[PDB]
Amino acid sequence: RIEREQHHLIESIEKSTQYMAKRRIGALISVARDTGMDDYIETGIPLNAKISSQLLINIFIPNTPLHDGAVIIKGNEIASAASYLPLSDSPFLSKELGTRHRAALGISEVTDSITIVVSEETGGISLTKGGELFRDVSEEELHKILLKELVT
Ligand SMILES: Nc1ncnc2c1ncn2[C@@H]1O[C@H](COP(=O)(O)OP(=O)(O)OP(=O)(O)O)[C@@H](O)[C@H]1O
Ligand SMILES: [Mn+2]
Ligand SMILES: [Mn+2]
């Protein structure tokens, strides 16, 4: 069922970001929806891989060929890793945040994608949607947002 797929995706994101946040492993994971992401998938290394927390983690290990860029998730696949997302030029984004967050914000401005960031400098988990930044959300907060947004 798609329902079981969507819940597995939530769990996959929750576990991998939780693992990566404890270890300050930067990460950037964009989930596409009605708005196509195919142009950005094509900038990356194709994976077309089953979604799992273990793969998400392995991708973002630092100084590895897959980690520099965004993971894009399309349907029930990790479509691509090391993809480019457009950067927000928004002057409202805090300057202590980094390029991952600016990239997470840029794509949320031009798609309806849900994107999730792990800061390598703080371990905070953030989320972007519709040009909004949810900064350093708690585990419970991330759970409800992903539940609300990714389960249809
Ligand atoms: N357009 C983009 N799309 C996706 N990833 C990007 C883009 N531009 C930069 N990145 C990623 O942003 C990271 C920038 O590395 P850098 O050493 O500058 O850390 P940083 O931006 O301070 O980190 P953080 O935001 O996690 O605190 C690199 O992984 C680079 O792959
Ligand atoms: Mn599962
Ligand atoms: Mn790097």
For residues 143 and 138, give the distance between their C-alpha atoms in angstroms, rounded to a whole number.
Answer: 8
Give me the phi and psi of 57, to 5 degrees please: -60, -55
- In this structure, how many other beta carbons lie within 10 angstroms of the beta carbon of residue 145? 17
The per-residue b/e assignment along 33-45, b for 16 or more CB within 10 angstroms, e otherwise, is eeeebeebbeebe
- Residue 98 CA: which ligand is closest? 1
Query: What is the 8-class DSSP label of residue 87?
Result: P
Q: Which of 40, 60, 93, 100 to mutate to test the pocket of ligand 1 (most atoms within 8 A of CB)?
A: 100
Would you call 144 exposed, middle or buried from its count of C-beta atoms within 10 A (0-12, 13-18, 19+)?
Answer: exposed
**In the structure encoding, which two tokens stand for residue 36, read together?**
């196509």
Name the residue with the closest Cα to ligand 1, atom 28: 68
- Ligand 1 pocket member 123 (CB < 6 A): no
Q: Which is it for strands 132-134 and 114-118: parallel, antiparallel or unpaired?
A: unpaired
Residue 98, annotated as binding a ligand: yes
Establish whether residue 70 lines the binding site of ligand 1, counting it when its CB lies within 6 angstroms of any ligand atom: yes
Q: In this structure, what are the phi and psi dihedrals at residue 74, rounded to the nearest 5 degrees?
A: -130, 130
Nearest Cα neighbor of 16 from 100, 119, 118 is 118
- How many H-runs (helices) and E-runs (strands) does the chain carry? 5, 7
Using CA atoms, how far apart are residues 59 and 72, in angstroms rounded to an integer? 12
DSSP characters over 106-144: HHHHHS--EEEEE-TTT--EEEEETTEEE-S--HHHHHH
Q: Where are the domains of the chain?
A: 1-152
The residue contributing the CA closest to ligand 1 atom 22 is 98
* Elucidated via: X-ray
Q: Ligand 1: does its nearest atom lie under 6 Å from the Cβ of 102?
A: no
68 annotated ligand-binding residue: yes
